[PDB]
Structure formats: structure tokens, C-alpha cells
Amino acid sequence: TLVEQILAEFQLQEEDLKKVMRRMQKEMDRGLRLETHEEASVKMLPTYVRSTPEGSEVGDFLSLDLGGTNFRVMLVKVGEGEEGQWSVKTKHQMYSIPEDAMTGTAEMLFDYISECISDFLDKHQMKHKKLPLGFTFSFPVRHEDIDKGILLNWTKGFKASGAEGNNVVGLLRDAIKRRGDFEMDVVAMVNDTVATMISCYYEDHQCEVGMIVGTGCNACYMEEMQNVELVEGDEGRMCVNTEWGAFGDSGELDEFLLEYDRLVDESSANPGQQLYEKLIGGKYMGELVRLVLLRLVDENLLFHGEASEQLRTRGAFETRFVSQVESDTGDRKQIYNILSTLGLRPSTTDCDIVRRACESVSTRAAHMCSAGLAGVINRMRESRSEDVMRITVGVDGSVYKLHPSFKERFHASVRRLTPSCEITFIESEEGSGRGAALVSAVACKKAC
Numbered sequence: 297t298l299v300e301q302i303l304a305e306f307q308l309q310e311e312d313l314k315k316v317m318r319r320m321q322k323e324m325d326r327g328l329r330l331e332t333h334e335e336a337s338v339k340m341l342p343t344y345v346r347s348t349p350e351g352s353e354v355g356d357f358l359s360l361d362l363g364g365t366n367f368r369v370m371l372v373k374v375g376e377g378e379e380g381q382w383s384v385k386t387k388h389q390m391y392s393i394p395e396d397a398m399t400g401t402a403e404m405l406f407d408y409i410s411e412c413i414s415d416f417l418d419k420h421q422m423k424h425k426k427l428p429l430g431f432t433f434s435f436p437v438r439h440e441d442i443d444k445g446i447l448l449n450w451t452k453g454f455k456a457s458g459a460e461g462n463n464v465v466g467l468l469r470d471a472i473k474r475r476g477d478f479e480m481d482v483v484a485m486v487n488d489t490v491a492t493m494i495s496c497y498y499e500d501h502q503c504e505v506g507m508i509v510g511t512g513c514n515a516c517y518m519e520e521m522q523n524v525e526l527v528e529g530d531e532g533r534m535c536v537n538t539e540w541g542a543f544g545d546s547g548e549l550d551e552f553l554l555e556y557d558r559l560v561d562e563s564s565a566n567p568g569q570q571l572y573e574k575l576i577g578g579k580y581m582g583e584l585v586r587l588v589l590l591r592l593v594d595e596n597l598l599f600h601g602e603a604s605e606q607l608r609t610r611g612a613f614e615t616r617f618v619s620q621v622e623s624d625t626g627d628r629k630q631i632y633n634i635l636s637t638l639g640l641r642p643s644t645t646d647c648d649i650v651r652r653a654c655e656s657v658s659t660r661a662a663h664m665c666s667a668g669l670a671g672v673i674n675r676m677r678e679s680r681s682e683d684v685m686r687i688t689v690g691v692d693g694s695v696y697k698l699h700p701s702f703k704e705r706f707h708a709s710v711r712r713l714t715p716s717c718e719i720t721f722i723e724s725e726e727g728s729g730r731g732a733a734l735v736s737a738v739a740c741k742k743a744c
């Protein structure tokens with residue numbers, strides 16, 4: 297119990313979750329209203345993606361995804377089906393981003409991006425054409441229109457100076473044409489949440505929410521235009537990007553923050569910011585474990601009081617170790633391998649303890665996350681008239697998809713928390729690229 301009592305600090309009651317849900321619903325109302333929008337943690341950024349799409353160009357589109365720790369570039373082909381537009385990834389390429397590129401300047405980083413695009417273009421007998429380019433850009437953006445918005449501030453560790461306060465679709469073109477190797481028509485910029493949602497629209501008109509549970513964690517949803525106070529109009533809906541990742545940054549979660557959270561945050565690339573994300577997201581989850589583990593050595597309850605050099609260094613306990621540890625079949629083989637690579641030699645009980653530390657961190661993530669989505673889904677309930685509200689949530693990200701129990705725990709919790717709602721959970725296929733394309737298809741009949 298000497299361990300079980302340390303890990304009991306991760307627990308959250310039905311009442312604790314409801315509190316978080318209600319507080320999230322409140323920060324969400326605060327971000328939509330003009331008086332409160334500027335100081336609101338939950339930014340509630342309008343995305344210009346609308347309920348009443350007029351046009352839509354059939355054909356081929358380039359899509360980018362910056363916001364993973366990778367940077368991806370792909371070609372997708374939009375056509376035309378019953379009730380909606382189909383899409384499909386046809387060519388794809390991933391590129392890493394070197395430490396010195398994300399350390400320097402925005403133009404140093406966006407220059408690198410331009411080089412990656414060209415490399416793609418050569419490879420595929422493309423370089424001669426200019427196509428409509430959709431850009432999935434997984435950070436907070438204050439949009440002026442579907443193709444203009446300023447990056448508010450980097451999240452998830454991204455660092456490149458001189459981008460905070462600048463038109464992103466700007467800095468993209470500025471580097472494309474700083475390299476007259478090629479040209480592209482930058483038609484749309486979207487969030488990953490939004491793209492994931494849009495990508496699901498085809499096979500489910502009910503899909504009115506998008507959720508990412510990956511490196512970071514965030515959600516978007518379809519708001520009534522009369523509630524979106526920062527866009528003029530009351531006609532139909534517009535997708536809103538909550539940036540629920542920064543929930544708690546005004547102390548909303550203070551009572552819930554554990555020592556390990558306060559330590560993760562201080563050491564992070566963005567202290568005092570993204571606190572709700574830091575309880576859930578992948579960039580953070582493994583580090584939460586690392587810290588829980590370190591305290592268990594200090595208290596002399598784990599690894600006979602002796603921690604490895606590797607275990608003592610920041611970010612050595614990867615998030616995927618949490619997933620693998622929770623996937624262990626009982627035989628401890630996987631937990632051993634992970635810890636052996638981490639320069640440790642763990643006992644039977646050491647491995648069992650590590651498992652319990654992982655389960656405690658990952659169960660908390662799932663529950664916090666459930667409170668958020670319950671917030672979002674219940675706000676939409678308060679604006680809907682059927683007996684039972686039927687809603688589909690489009691979801692992507694490695695934590696949600698790949699972690700063994702996250703999704704089952706998440707689902708059940710969100711369900712407890714959302715009476716008179718029927719929620720359907722759809723996982724997006726190439727959501728980020730196909731989403732950005734499908735959006736770009738529409739803003740093309742709105743332009744050229």
C-alpha cells in the first residue's frame with residue numbers, strides 16, 4: 297500500500313470529473329463571448345469552416361501536416377458522391393525536422409518546409425504544376441479568414457523565433473517564393489481537429505466534433521453562429537477550435553495538479569501554459585511516468601532505491617513505453633525489455649509497480665479527457681431539441697488509437713458524463729491531409 301497510496305493521488309471521483317466538465321463548459325462560454333475572449337484560456341478560435349458549404353472543386357490537392365514531430369506532405373484526390381464529396385490520399389512523404397531548424401527562426405523553419413515540398417514534387421512528376429494547397433497546422437491560430445490567421449504561440453515544444461504574431465499562410469508563401477523552384481495556390485489553412493472532423497463528414501453527416509489525443513490534445517466542434525461572437529452573422533454553423541489544451545492556465549485545475557505535473561510544467565518549453573494538455577498529451581505522458589518512477593526510488597520502494605542514469609534524464613521514458621507496458625500480457629517480458637533498455641534490472645514486483653504507475657497516469661489522462669469532451673458534447677446538447685442527441689466525434693492521435701485501454705476507459709467515462717446523448721466514435725483515415733483537401737475543395741469555388 298506504500299506504493300498504492302502514492303498512486304492513489306492520481307484517482308478522480310465522479311464528482312471530480314463533473315467539476316472539470318462544468319468548469320470546461322464555463323471557460324468555453326467565456327472564450328466565445330467578446331468581453332471575455334481576450335483573457336479566456338479556452339480561446340474558442342473560429343475556423344471559418346462553415347455549415348452551409350456552397351461550392352467544391354473536384355480534382356487534385358496538395359496537403360501539408362505540420363504539428364506532428366514529423367512534417368508530412370501529400371497529394372489527395374477529391375471527387376463527388378451521393379450527398380457529399382469523397383477524397384483519397386494518393387502520394388505521401390514524411391520528413392524529419394532537425395534540431396537546428398526548430399531552434400533558429402520562422403524563416404529558417406519555413407525554408408526547410410519549402411525544400412521538403414520540392415523534394416516531394418520532383419519524386420512524383422509533379423514539379424511543373426501548381427496545385428491547390430491545403431495546410432493542416434496543429435497550433436493555435438487567430439484566423440481572419442479560411443486562408444489567413446496569425447500563430448498565437450507555439451505549443452508541444454516547437455520553438456522557432458519570430459513566428460508568434462505572424463500570418464502563417466504568409467510565412468509559407470514568403471519561403472515558397474524565396475525559393476522560385478516551384479509555386480502553389482495556398483487555398484486553406486486548418487487545425488488537425490478540424491481536418492479530422494471534415495474527413496469524417498462524408499460517411500457521417502452527424503460528425504460535428506473533432507478530437508486529437510496524440511502528442512497534444514485538443515478538440516473542435518460545430519457552434520451556432522449566434523454564439524460565435526467574433527464572427528458577424530447568425531446563419532447556420534461554424535467549426536470552432538477550442539484549444540482546450542490551455543484549460544487550467546488561469547488556475548482552473550489548481551486543486552488537481554500533482555507534484556509531478558508542477559515538475560513537468562516548470563521543465564517544459566512553455567511553463568504555466570497548456571496545463572490540461574500536459575495531463576493527457578503524448579509529449580507529456582511518459583515524462584509523468586518517469587517522474588512518478590523517480591519519486592518511488594527516492595522513497596526507496598522501487599528498483600531497491602537505485603535509479604539508472606538514463607532514468608534520471610528528461611524525456612528518456614517515452615510515451616510509447618507507457619503503451620507497451622500496459623500491453624504486457626502478464627509475463628513481464630515487455631516491461632523487462634523496456635526497463636533493461638533503460639539501463640535497469642527490475643524484479644517481479646518492480647515491473648508490477650511500473651505497470652501500476654503507467655495505469656495511474658494513463659487512466660487519469662482518459663478521465664480528464666472524458667470531462668472535456670463531455671463539456672463539449674453537453675454544451676451542444678443545451679442548443680438541441682430532440683429527446684436524445686445523436687452525435688459523431690471524429691478522433692485521431694497515437695494515445696487514443698494505440699494505447700491499450702485509453703479508448704475503452706475514455707468512452708465509458710464520457711458516456712457516464714453525457715446522459716441523453718448517443719455518441720458515435722469514428723477514427724479518421726488520413727484525417728489531416730484528406731481534411732485539409734476537402735476544405736480546400738470548397739474555398740476553391742469560393743476563389744478561382
Ligand SMILES: Cc1csc(Nc2ncccc2Oc2ccccc2C#N)n1
Pocket residue numbers: 344345346347348349442494497501503504518734735736738739
Ligand atoms: C468555408 C468552408 C470550407 S469547407 C466548409 N465546410 C465543409 N466542408 C467539407 C465538408 C463539410 C463541411 O461543412 C460541415 C461541417 C460539419 C458538419 C456539417 C457540415 C455541413 N454541411 N466550409
Ligand SMILES: OC[C@H]1O[C@H](O)[C@H](O)[C@@H](O)[C@@H]1O
Pocket residue numbers: 363433434435436451452487488489508510511512513514539541573
Ligand atoms: O495536435 C493536437 C493539438 O495540439 C496542440 O494543443 C495545438 O495547440 C492544437 O492546435 C492541436 O490541434
